[PDB]
Ligand binder design. Structure first.
Ligand SMILES: O=P(O)(O)OCCOCCOCCOCCOCCOCCO
Ligand SMILES: O=P(O)(O)OCCOCCOCCOCCOCCOCCO
Ligand SMILES: [Cl-]
Lengths: 164, 164
């Protein structure tokens, strides 16, 4: 899959889906999830409740309420178990599998497990990169950053990856 | 499994096994492998030749020649595929599985894939840590560093891991 890094607010992403760093109970609270629930509205949590508890490392899809995306993909990175590079790998892979299963073309992510999970961003981005490279080229992943300095860094890393 | 970080020369490790960062052809050359072959002698490569080509992510055990260890565990982190956090995870896990299968008590590792593979040490150590925690407590893993500053850093990281 293709990758781009930009500065912005993931809740204003205007594509097919955004990926939420979720707990395995799919309870929207800390981090981006809170923003997702405020701007997308109550229907997102209600749909999550219909799904019920999942497994750390799994992903689940709901509608995106009042957000300008089609879907929210809830990638469970923690909950009964603490976040780790392994849960981040599995959840990123599960999120990608849902995107491909729905024939999505544009999907936004943040650095799963690096905020609420406590993991270092550099390691998280590397495992995400490894999983994203396995998805088909019909899919474009956008990493959304709070800062241009942040986005420029990941962009620099991504160019360094071509040597070789 | 228990973990300790010390400064030293892994080829002088005086326990059950040392883990070699190998290619999947088990050809000893670049990095620690070269030191292993010089100090352990030709029998190590000869035994590797008897084994033949393995798979990136797998591990293989040989005798340690003139080294003061019982076994060399060749953890294949690269070769037909470039080194990645995923191959490092699989190889570390494969290396640990061989150690447990032989009832080993003390095993030394370096940061697999961080030298010859080009991966950043901090990410490599984190995935190794996650795999080592799954091995039984009968096993003690020693990380061997060229520098005390290096070992102290990993030791500091390991203490930070207890919060929580
Ligand atoms: O969540 C923490 C906020 O992280 C925002 C940065 O998100 C980057 C996500 O990138 C996802 C793309 O990663 C590819 C690595 O190169
Ligand atoms: O190979 C690169 C040289 O790396 C030497 C440092 O090795 C550390 C191996 O540690 C192995 C133990 O890692 C646990 C992480 O905490
Ligand atoms: Cl990983």
């Amino acid at each position: 899959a293709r990758i781009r890094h930009v500065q912005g607010d993931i809740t204003e992403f205007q594509g097919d889906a955004i990926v939420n760093a979720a707990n395995n109970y799919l309870k929207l609270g800390a981090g981006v999830a809170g923003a997702i629930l405020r701007k997308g509205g109550p229907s997102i949590q209600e749909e999550c409740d219909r799904i019920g508890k999942i497994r750390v490392g799994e992903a689940a899809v709901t509608g995106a309420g009042n957000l300008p995306v089609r879907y929210v993909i809830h990638a469970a990175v923690l909950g009964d178990e603490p976040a780790s590079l392994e849960t981040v790998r599995k959840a990123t892979k599960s999120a990608l599998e849902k995107a491909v299963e729905l024939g999505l073309k544009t999907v936004a992510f943040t650095a799963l497990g690096a905020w609420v999970g406590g993991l270092p961003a550099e390691a998280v981005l590397r495992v995400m990169l490894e999983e994203i490279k396995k998805a088909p080229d019909t899919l474009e992943v956008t990493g959304v950053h709070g800062t241009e300095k942040s986005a420029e860094a990941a962009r620099r890393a991504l160019l360094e990856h071509h040597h070789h």
